[PDB]
Amino acid sequence: QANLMRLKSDLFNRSPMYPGPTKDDPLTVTLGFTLQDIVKVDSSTNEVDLVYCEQQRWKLNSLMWDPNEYGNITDFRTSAADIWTPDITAYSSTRPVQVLSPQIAVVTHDGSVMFIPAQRLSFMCDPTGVDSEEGVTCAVKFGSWVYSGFEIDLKTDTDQVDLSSYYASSKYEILSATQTRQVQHYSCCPEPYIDVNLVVKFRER
């Protein structure tokens, strides 16, 4: 404890908080979705509810440290409020996302942070045909709300959504699940914008 205590102090009570990435000192955030359950489908409003864990990873130089200087410590857990976090946000949400897990992250000595909040999201999806065999396909983009590609770059470890822990007895069965980096430009603005497209095709059982 005494060691971790000093480390946490030296990391957080030292200089002002990290002000977030900038065009000059850009930052790369790695997304990974784990889909747990498609809970509800509302064919009268075309809202659909997912429960997924969203895995976020970035690295700050300002969070590095030598384990030899701090009792052979390689990593600690700490509150997501003790540190800067990427404003990764869903675009087609129709209700404020509900948080299902603790707001705690894992800072590692190389300066990498892993943060995996579990969430229940309601997004725009027309579930027409979900009762058929070929099913229905719906999608939702995730990305930063205020940062462009110049400041925050998004990257996936993989195309395949982690379905390993998908509710075995869900009302709905997953036919495919996809996380795909996309790069848009708007006319107005010369700067790149990055999202990850979450695309699940599903049906009743």
Query: Backbone dihedral region of 24: left (phi > 0), alpha (psi from -120 to 50 degrees) or beta?
Result: alpha
- Is residue 68 close enough to count as binding a copy of itself by CB under 8 A? no
Buried b (16+ CB within 10 A) or exposed e, 10-19: ebeeeeeeee
Q: Are strands 27-42 and 152-156 parallel, antiparallel or unpaired?
A: parallel
Q: Two tokens at 25?
A: 């000192």
Binding-residue pattern over the window 1 to 30 for a copy of itself, x denoting contact by CB under 8 A: x-xxx--xx-----xx-xxx-x-xx-----
DSSP letter assigned to residue 165: T
Taking CB under 8 A as the binding criterion, the range among 88-96, 175-183, 196-204 that sits at the site for a copy of itself is 88-96
- Asked if 195 is part of the footprint of a copy of itself (rule: CB under 8 A), the reply reads no
Say how far apart CA 54 and CA 37 lie, in whole Å.
13
Site map (CB under 8 A) of a copy of itself, residues 95-134, x = contact:
xx-xxxxx-xxx---------x-x-x---x-x--------
d(CA 134, CA 184): 30
User: Does residue number 150 form part of the binding site for a copy of itself (CB under 8 A)?
Assistant: no
Q: Which residues make up the interface to a copy of itself (CB under 8 A)?
A: 1, 3-5, 8-9, 15-16, 18-20, 22, 24-25, 36-37, 39-40, 44-47, 51, 62, 71-73, 76-78, 87, 89, 92-96, 98-102, 104-106, 116, 118, 120, 124, 126, 145-147, 151, 167, 169-171
